[PDB]
Structure 1
Amino acid sequence: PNFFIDRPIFAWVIAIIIMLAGGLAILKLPVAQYPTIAPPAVTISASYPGADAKTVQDTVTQVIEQNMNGIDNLMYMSSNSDSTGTVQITLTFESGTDADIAQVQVQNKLQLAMPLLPQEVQQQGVSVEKSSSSFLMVVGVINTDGTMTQEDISDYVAANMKDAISRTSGVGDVQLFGSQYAMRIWMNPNELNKFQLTPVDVITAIKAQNAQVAAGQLGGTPPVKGQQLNASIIAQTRLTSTEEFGKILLKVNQDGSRVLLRDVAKIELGGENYDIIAEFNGQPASGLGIKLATGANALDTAAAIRAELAKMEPFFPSGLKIVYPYDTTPFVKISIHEVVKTLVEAIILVFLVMYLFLQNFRATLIPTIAVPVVLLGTFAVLAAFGFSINTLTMFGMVLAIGLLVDDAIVVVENVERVMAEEGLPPKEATRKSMGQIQGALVGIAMVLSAVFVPMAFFGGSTGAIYRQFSITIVSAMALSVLVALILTPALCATMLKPIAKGDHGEGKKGFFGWFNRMFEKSTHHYTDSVGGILRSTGRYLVLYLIIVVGMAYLFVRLPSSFLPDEDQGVFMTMVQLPAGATQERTQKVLNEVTHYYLTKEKNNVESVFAVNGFGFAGRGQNTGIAFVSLKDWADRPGEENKVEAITMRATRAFSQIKDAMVFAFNLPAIVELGTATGFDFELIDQAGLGHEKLTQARNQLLAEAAKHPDMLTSVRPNGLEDTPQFKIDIDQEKAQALGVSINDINTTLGAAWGGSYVNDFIDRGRVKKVYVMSEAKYRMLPDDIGDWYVRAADGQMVPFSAFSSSRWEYGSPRLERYNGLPSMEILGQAAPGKSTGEAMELMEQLASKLPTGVGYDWTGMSYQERLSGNQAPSLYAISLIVVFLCLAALYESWSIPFSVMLVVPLGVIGALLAATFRGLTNDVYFQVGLLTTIGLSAKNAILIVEFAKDLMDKEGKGLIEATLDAVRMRLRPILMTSLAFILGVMPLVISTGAGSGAQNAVGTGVMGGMVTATVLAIFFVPVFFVVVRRRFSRKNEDIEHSH
């Protein structure tokens, strides 16, 4: 400590070592927008083509929900049974669980269910995956010549690019947007009734002529003695061409003129599914969602991927151009550009404050070398714990710049003051001052981690977000107190200039600040004054109670955010038609929307990625979505050229002037967020009930919560209501008669109207599928039911209308389950004034008004809130108590910690103030901000109380005279820090452009906080000290001691 004063070089060496480890950690440290924050979820998905909601709910879904037992750390299970036959089961696991293990255990219990599945599902594929939605990037592929359709493009994407980019370093999951080429066989109902054939015969035909065969080998083992030739027998090779599919023989006519498949059906190379259609600025497109690899660098994955795409540019088909619809990367680089700008700026301001105050270049260089070192190291302690350069951790740095800077300033100052006062040569001056602040700095260390550490231990997703701040800040802190104890005292002692005793440089100079006098008189003004506010403390205690209560009111009338919504260079607009609607109507809406953007937002939009068949509303022709891109930030200057007003005006258009609801909006920060003032409800059927009864229970709870607009707002179901569905009743009897097989009936009806995945071929060197399905025009209207004939065993065709009734009814197209049982999901948020939890309780008191077999439960956001929200008081109680014990340690008091713990309010009231006036909100950044503020409040109060005591004890000064001296000698440094801080933070607060919402959240509270903090503390701390001190023993006294 003292030690390194006589070893500047041992210190330089430690400094150097920390700088080198930091910079090493700086070159090879990952960069991403946010760290892993959401609990781990694994998804099982299967597609049962042709099935309806109930078919998949009961054939695949429930069989899997039954075989999901004994998997470690299950939080909950949710599943969709979509009317496109796709079922999606999400198991969301307890926070921080091994993703890898959870997925493997899930997949190996699913694999125990696999035989219990239907063979279309078994062969279509059940898939188990990690449930991130956070795509690093969505890359679009097009063709300018317009030559190729989506299916063309998609196939190409799959066959040239998808793999070499997925070999690009930093790329984890690669996922394709669209369907690959399969052999599409479009049957004809006439040309089928003509040669008296059914789908079944087409099927078996295709299974027959199109396969590989278990052949054998010439000269094989075991051979015959003397054998001499050994070679592999080739047999039936699968068909490569459309051509050979035209040539497949369906039947022989009696006169022998034959029937090839070519005749009865249209045969083409066509997409594996035609549900979802993508337009890129109206131009045909397919896409690739690339995910950042696990632990990888986002920005270099981005540069490598773009370079690997461009390397392919000499091999691209004509006019086929790559495009970039969604890119996390540019926003991230620019976020980082601004954080770096900040750190170096806040630094630069500290140099200015320190010069235009200590007016000595070499004093000015010491913190100039101190914090660079504190930085580098913090990067290393973070590198060591496996953290990354993302939003939360860097704004953790920003948030910490104040304690780091302060720690340097306190020291350099105290030394210079020792010289200014006492006239010691520099080295002896530094031992004198270090000798004065050392123990306090250990104390400050202890009270600071005492507030910053409990916030590491929060639970859930919130707990994650906090742990980033907690750790970043405690490491910056710990390293800043070491740099304060090893390097700076050594830098102070070695490169600091001696001051002639009582110099103060008053007058002395002209061009560069008569200021000193101007500063000088003033500090006396200050002390003359302060003893007076100690002359009659009463008033000031009143005022204090006032400040506190105000702090509380200001605090309660504060809104509770989670994170700021940010213009991310991209947003999206989602489209919903009425139920039952067609691909064509929906597509109409998307086209309209796209043109609105490309027209009336000609200055803003760059590109519109319209996607039909896909909503986040659900799956269906009915739903559509348009992924919207904006021009880079330097070209969108204004206030209504930014996302707020863009989405505002777009939704403005599409609200009134439509037959369908189309809302356009900006995405949450953490792309899987909680809705702060809300909930995600699950109403559940527990006793064996039918969909009709639970739905009625949902309607009932819906109407009951609509009846409380004083507590709840927009409580809605998160599915699709029942639609009309069209039932075919096969009178088993009537067709039993007609000499038909029901297998043939069902499966011909099937392969006609849904289609059938039959067999596989080999296209251009790539195994791809073969589907057989009706052509378009024979399967649209219920009348087309007639065009289909089933051949009897005796030899005659039969119409469908000979053995079937047909009708309309309702049914549900989307069948939800919660933890194995049938459920209906209600999203919703709390009335503007009240808290989410209260609305949650009102919801429980409401859904308790539901029938037997109607139970409820909470999920996702409301799960994470109901388990981990009663924590906030326990942890800050540990903070209050731990901080109190640390200070009690530092001094020697059960009371003196009270003069310094009482300082906390003085800081908050400016922060609540600032939040309130800038109309911001009590969010994460505000809270870490709060702590930071309280943090310096305490640092300062601790140094002033320390000094007062030191004078009382180690000099026999009185109470008031010592508090006066103390406050005096610490006036200059309080001000030095606070000037720099306030000036370093200042830019954060005044910023518009990429992410400046954070910068705002961080800046505001801090600035106001610092203001009310210093400019209160320099008046209340003596009062805090003096009053508390007058509730201790006897004599001494008012004090003129000895020794």
Structure 2
Amino acid sequence: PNFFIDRPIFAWVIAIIIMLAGGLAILKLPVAQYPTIAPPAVTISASYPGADAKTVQDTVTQVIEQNMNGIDNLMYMSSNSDSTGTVQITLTFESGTDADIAQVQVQNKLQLAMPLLPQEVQQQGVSVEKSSSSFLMVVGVINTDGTMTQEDISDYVAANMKDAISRTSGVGDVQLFGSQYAMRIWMNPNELNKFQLTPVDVITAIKAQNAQVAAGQLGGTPPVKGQQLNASIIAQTRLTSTEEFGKILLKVNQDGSRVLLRDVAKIELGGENYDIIAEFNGQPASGLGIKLATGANALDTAAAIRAELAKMEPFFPSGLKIVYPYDTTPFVKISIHEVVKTLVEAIILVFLVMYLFLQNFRATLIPTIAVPVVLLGTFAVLAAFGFSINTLTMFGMVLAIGLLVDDAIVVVENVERVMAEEGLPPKEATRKSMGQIQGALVGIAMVLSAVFVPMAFFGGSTGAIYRQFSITIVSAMALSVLVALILTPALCATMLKPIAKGDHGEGKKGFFGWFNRMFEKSTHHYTDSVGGILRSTGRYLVLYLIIVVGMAYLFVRLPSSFLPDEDQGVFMTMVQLPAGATQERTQKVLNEVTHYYLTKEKNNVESVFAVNGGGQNTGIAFVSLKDWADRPGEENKVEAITMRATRAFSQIKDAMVFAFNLPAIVELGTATGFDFELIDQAGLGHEKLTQARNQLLAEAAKHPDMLTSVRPNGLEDTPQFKIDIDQEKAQALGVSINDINTTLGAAWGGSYVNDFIDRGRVKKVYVMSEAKYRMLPDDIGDWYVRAADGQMVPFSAFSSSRWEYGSPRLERYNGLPSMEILGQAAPGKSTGEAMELMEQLASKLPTGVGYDWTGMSYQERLSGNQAPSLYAISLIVVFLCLAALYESWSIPFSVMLVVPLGVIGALLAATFRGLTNDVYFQVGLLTTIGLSAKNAILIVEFAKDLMDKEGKGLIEATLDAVRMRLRPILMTSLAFILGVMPLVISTGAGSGAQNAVGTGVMGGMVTATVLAIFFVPVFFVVVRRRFSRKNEDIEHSH
């Protein structure tokens, strides 16, 4: 501290080291939009080709679910059992469970469920993965010259790329928009019936003429003495072409005729599956959908993927291009880049102010060189504590520049002050003021971390979010203080120009300095007036109370957010067709969408990626937007875009189409929004539960005063078709039931049979009916079974058939059949209030219908009521700190009474714009109280100290005080408010965030300072005039 003033070079090395070290602690740090907020979940996926929802649910799901016991830190278990036969069991865990070991604890129960599973399931593959809900990115592939279709491309993607994107570390799941090539054998039931053959024979045959065999070795081990040739046997090898699959012999007739496969069925290189079809601006395309692994770094993973595709790019087919339809990336990149623009500029700004008030370049380089230092170094406090260069901590740098600048300033200022007052040279001035503000700087560093740590102790994911801020700020704070003892005074004595007693640069050279006179007169005027009021104190007690109360109302009557909405440069439109419609109709709709965007949004939309699939009734489109630069308007930002778009796809359709932008809060809580689970307890049947769901739905639809969008998050029961097989008749006529089953299956369901080698890559062999003979209930008639004897028996020979209901989607939560009911709270009302009303409507449902919460509103029924304790505690701590520093019980109150003066500015700021009491508004509000604290503390400090250590009177000591370190006040706040200025202006990346920070802080700051340099005195005085008895006229000691 003192030491360095005689060792400036040692200090410059401490600073240059902090800067270069913060620089290396900057190159190796995480980058993110937000931190990892989402809890770890492990998902179990499996497929049962042809199965129905109730099928998978009773064959795979409960077989897996029941084996999921003894898993550590289990939070909740939810599974979708699909009419598409797929089952997905997401097991979400307590936040910060070891991704990897949990995933191990789950797959080690899946392996006990495995051998008691279907063989179709077991061989199609069961997968366990730690993945996010949302796509890190979606990679497109198209062919510009139309030379190949969607299925061809799907093959290229799945056979030249996808296996290494899924081995890139950090890559959780890839969903493929398309499918890999397969040996597709589409059977003619007639051309089969001719020869009296069944699918089953096709199965056997395929297995037979196409296989590998363990051959062996000529001159094998062990050989006989003298043997001299050793080489391998090559036998039956897997098949290569479609031709050879025709050239398969299924049954030889009496009459010399061969019955080939070629005859009995059509054979083609085709899709393993035809559910999902993808079109990019109408042009056919196949795609890569990347979902992020649990916990891995976004921007790192994505750079690894970019490099993998760059690595593959020189070997692609003629005219085969990659497209990038959806990318969460350049937005986080450009956004944080904008926050950096602010940091650089606000520094340049603070230099501008610093010059104005000190009109001396080398002098002004002291605090301008100062802040660069504290910054660089704080990135280093984080690389030490494991945080990340994320939005919250970056807006932390932005928010902390205020405390940094204020400390550097008060230093260089008190030096200049003493030099101008007493007439001492530099060093002696340094030692003097530094000796004065050291104790002050320490007290302020600890009362400031006395407010900023309690909001660090918040719970839930929200707590991760708030602590990010709390730590970047407290640590940056300690660093500017440490700097303020090392670098700062050193530079004062080094390069601050020595000032002759009584300069005040008053009216010297005129150009730059009528300012000096004018300011001078006004700082006096100011203190004259500080006095004028310091006399009648009563009214100001009142006006203050009024201000308090106002702050309150204004506070309450302000909307509470979570985060900001962001034009993230990329969005989507989503499509839901009426339950059970067909692939082709959905495709119709999606094509409509693609057209709307390429039409009445040509200037904003660059590219559409429509995806039809998963399963026919539903489609979606990833709409990429033309660069931000060419989208100026208030209408060219996503909000109005999706607004007017949804307006299009609302009125002129047969089925509903949401058009929307993905939230910035990737995979977590909305506004006032919850996620209800209706749970079966007694075994009331999918029906009693279903009707119960409709019951809660209807009874909440009854309260528009409380709730909004009471909806199930499933599909309703659609009609399912039952072919009730007569065991007796079929065993009578000579048909084994096994055979009826597998024929009806491999016909209408299909079957994975054998594996083949296409172009050197092992793909699957799927045999199924040709389309036309398996569409209409009628075609049931077209299928026969070769009985025990040698006669074909028609399906209508052993089968009764009828229509019924079934569900396409069977959800299960924590084991039991369940149904997911989303909901939001009324326009004005709190999420929790609406949750209470739901608990109150769901308490009236039938015997055995119970309830629970998940996802977002679990995350909300967890934390709450914490803000008042943490701020009450933060207050008892701050007060206690001030009784400490000021050695009085009664004195501290004065520096506290200041809290409103910053508050009311920010609340009036939010309100008078269109903003909201969110995260940013709150961290900023904190910061503002921070500086208020600073300022006032210094004021009361000098007044007390003058009263005590130079013996002055009350009113006179305060007045002296208020006058003397006023010029710094003003310097700080201009420095800030100007540095803040950009945030509240600009549109471009992240400007929702920016503007949120900025406004609150700027407004806070105005009233803060230019109400405080008038209220702080009054505080101290009325405060002091309620302690001891000697405090005015005082004198004494020397």
Question: TM-score, normalised to structure 1's length?
Answer: 0.97
- The 5 Å alignment of 1:269-288 reads 269-288=269-288
Compare 922-931 and 448-457 and name the one that shifted more.
Answer: 448-457
- The 5 Å alignment of 1:728-767 reads 728-767=723-762
Q: 2: CA distance between counterparts of 1:125 and 1:381?
A: 47
Contact between 1:30 and 1:296, CA under 8 Å: does it hold in 2? no
1:172 Cα deviation after fit: 6.8
Q: 1: CA distance between counterparts of 2:780 and 2:574?
A: 35
Matched position secondary structure for 1:713: strand
Q: 2: CA distance between counterparts of 1:837 and 1:846?
A: 14
1:168 Cα deviation after fit: 7.3
Q: 1: CA distance between counterparts of 2:172 and 2:678?
A: 37
Aligned to 1:832: 827
Contact between 1:31 and 1:296, CA under 8 Å: does it hold in 2? no
Q: 1: CA distance between counterparts of 2:852 and 2:326?
A: 36
Q: 1: CA distance between counterparts of 2:22 and 2:920?
A: 26
1:933 paired residue among 905, 928, 939: 928
Contact between 1:299 and 1:333, CA under 8 Å: does it hold in 2? no
Check 1:123–1:431 CA distance in 2 against 1; reply closer, same or farther (3 A cut).
same
- Provide Cα deviations, 1:281-330, integer angstroms capped at 9, x if missing partner: 11111112346788887667666755664565543222212111112222
Q: 1: CA distance between counterparts of 2:283 and 2:560?
A: 44
Aligned to 1:329: 329
Compare 867-876 and 808-817 and name the one that shifted more.
Answer: 867-876
Contact between 2:573 and 2:621, CA under 8 Å: does it hold in 1? yes
Aligned to 2:152: 152
Q: 1: CA distance between counterparts of 2:966 and 2:545?
A: 25
Aligned to 1:552: 552
Check 1:119–1:164 CA distance in 2 against 1; reply closer, same or farther (3 A cut).
closer
Q: 1: CA distance between counterparts of 2:534 and 2:353?
A: 30
Gaps of 5+ in 2: none
1:392 Cα deviation after fit: 2.1
1:114 Cα deviation after fit: 0.6
1:17 matches 2:17: yes
Q: 2: CA distance between counterparts of 1:1001 and 1:1022?
A: 32
1:885 Cα deviation after fit: 2.5
1:141 Cα deviation after fit: 0.3
1:1022 Cα deviation after fit: 1.0
Contact between 1:45 and 1:89, CA under 8 Å: does it hold in 2? yes
Q: 2: CA distance between counterparts of 1:293 and 1:977?
A: 45
Aligned length: 1038
Compare 525-534 and 356-365 and name the one that shifted more.
Answer: 525-534
Contact between 1:56 and 1:87, CA under 8 Å: does it hold in 2? yes
Contact between 2:449 and 2:474, CA under 8 Å: does it hold in 1? yes
Q: 2: CA distance between counterparts of 1:1020 and 1:349?
A: 28
Aligned to 1:472: 472
Contact between 2:506 and 2:513, CA under 8 Å: does it hold in 1? no
Q: 2: CA distance between counterparts of 1:293 and 1:697?
A: 37
1:371 Cα deviation after fit: 0.9
1:459 Cα deviation after fit: 2.2
1:29 Cα deviation after fit: 2.8
Q: 2: CA distance between counterparts of 1:766 and 1:447?
A: 68
- Provide Cα deviations, 1:530-588, integer angstroms capped at 9, x if missing partner: 12222122111112221111111111111111111111111111111111101111111
Aligned to 1:871: 866
Q: 1: CA distance between counterparts of 2:287 and 2:599?
A: 25
- Provide Cα deviations, 1:241-300, integer angstroms capped at 9, x if missing partner: 212111111111122321111111111111111111111111111112346788887667
Compare 449-458 and 526-535 and name the one that shifted more.
Answer: 449-458
1:10 Cα deviation after fit: 1.8
Matched position secondary structure for 1:921: coil
- Provide Cα deviations, 1:163-189, integer angstroms capped at 9, x if missing partner: 566677986765533211111111111
- Provide Cα deviations, 1:850-901, integer angstroms capped at 9, x if missing partner: 1111111111111111112232222223312222222232221333221112
Matched position secondary structure for 1:50: coil
1:143 Cα deviation after fit: 1.0
1:959 Cα deviation after fit: 1.9
Matched position secondary structure for 2:545: helix
- The 5 Å alignment of 1:583-594 reads 583-594=583-594
Check 1:801–1:169 CA distance in 2 against 1; reply closer, same or farther (3 A cut).
closer
1:79 matches 2:74: no
Check 1:623–1:255 CA distance in 2 against 1; reply closer, same or farther (3 A cut).
same
Contact between 1:578 and 1:622, CA under 8 Å: does it hold in 2? yes
Q: 2: CA distance between counterparts of 1:134 and 1:624?
A: 17
- Provide Cα deviations, 1:467-524, integer angstroms capped at 9, x if missing partner: 2212222221121111111110111121111111121111111122311111011111
1:385 Cα deviation after fit: 2.2
Check 1:173–1:484 CA distance in 2 against 1; reply closer, same or farther (3 A cut).
farther
1:136 Cα deviation after fit: 3.4
Contact between 1:164 and 1:308, CA under 8 Å: does it hold in 2? yes
Compare 392-401 and 843-852 and name the one that shifted more.
Answer: 392-401
Contact between 2:131 and 2:293, CA under 8 Å: does it hold in 1? no
Question: TM-score, normalised to structure 2's length?
Answer: 0.97
- The 5 Å alignment of 1:605-1004 reads 605-612=605-612, 619-1004=614-999
1:610 Cα deviation after fit: 0.7
Contact between 1:30 and 1:295, CA under 8 Å: does it hold in 2? no
Contact between 1:586 and 1:624, CA under 8 Å: does it hold in 2? yes
Q: 2: CA distance between counterparts of 1:773 and 1:279?
A: 26
Contact between 1:19 and 1:373, CA under 8 Å: does it hold in 2? yes
Q: 2: CA distance between counterparts of 1:30 and 1:394?
A: 12
Check 1:671–1:731 CA distance in 2 against 1; reply closer, same or farther (3 A cut).
same
Q: 2: CA distance between counterparts of 1:598 and 1:546?
A: 56
Query: How large is the RMSD of aligned CA atoms in angstroms?
Result: 1.9
Contact between 2:132 and 2:172, CA under 8 Å: does it hold in 1? no
Q: 1: CA distance between counterparts of 2:15 and 2:292?
A: 35
Q: 2: CA distance between counterparts of 1:353 and 1:423?
A: 25
Q: 2: CA distance between counterparts of 1:712 and 1:805?
A: 47
Matched position secondary structure for 2:843: helix
- Provide Cα deviations, 1:699-725, integer angstroms capped at 9, x if missing partner: 111111111111111111111111111
Contact between 1:679 and 1:828, CA under 8 Å: does it hold in 2? yes
Check 1:232–1:750 CA distance in 2 against 1; reply closer, same or farther (3 A cut).
same
Q: 1: CA distance between counterparts of 2:350 and 2:543?
A: 33
Contact between 1:39 and 1:460, CA under 8 Å: does it hold in 2? no
1:388 Cα deviation after fit: 2.5
- Provide Cα deviations, 1:960-989, integer angstroms capped at 9, x if missing partner: 111111111121111111111111111111
Q: 2: CA distance between counterparts of 1:848 and 1:953?
A: 68
Contact between 2:351 and 2:368, CA under 8 Å: does it hold in 1? yes
Q: 1: CA distance between counterparts of 2:172 and 2:580?
A: 38
- The 5 Å alignment of 1:1011-1022 reads 1011-1022=1006-1017
Check 1:246–1:716 CA distance in 2 against 1; reply closer, same or farther (3 A cut).
same
Matched position secondary structure for 1:586: helix
- Provide Cα deviations, 1:43-91, integer angstroms capped at 9, x if missing partner: 1111111111111111111111111111111111111111101111111
Gaps of 5+ in 1: 613-617
1:656 Cα deviation after fit: 0.9
- Provide Cα deviations, 1:414-454, integer angstroms capped at 9, x if missing partner: 11111111111111111111111111211211122222222
1:333 Cα deviation after fit: 2.6
- Provide Cα deviations, 1:122-174, integer angstroms capped at 9, x if missing partner: 11111111121343332210112222222211111122233566677986765
User: Identity of counterpart residues, as a percentage?
Assistant: 100
1:660 Cα deviation after fit: 1.0
Q: 2: CA distance between counterparts of 1:15 and 1:573?
A: 52
Q: 1: CA distance between counterparts of 2:134 and 2:616?
A: 25
- Provide Cα deviations, 1:779-806, integer angstroms capped at 9, x if missing partner: 1111111111112111111111111111
Compare 885-894 and 704-713 and name the one that shifted more.
Answer: 885-894
Check 1:923–1:650 CA distance in 2 against 1; reply closer, same or farther (3 A cut).
same
- Provide Cα deviations, 1:603-650, integer angstroms capped at 9, x if missing partner: 1110111111xxxxx942111111111101111112211111111111
Q: 1: CA distance between counterparts of 2:892 and 2:232?
A: 90
Q: 2: CA distance between counterparts of 1:735 and 1:175?
A: 43
Q: 1: CA distance between counterparts of 2:104 and 2:167?
A: 24
Matched position secondary structure for 2:320: coil
Q: 1: CA distance between counterparts of 2:507 and 2:275?
A: 84
Check 1:642–1:842 CA distance in 2 against 1; reply closer, same or farther (3 A cut).
same
Contact between 1:82 and 1:619, CA under 8 Å: does it hold in 2? no
Q: 1: CA distance between counterparts of 2:303 and 2:712?
A: 42
1:386 Cα deviation after fit: 2.5
Check 1:88–1:294 CA distance in 2 against 1; reply closer, same or farther (3 A cut).
closer
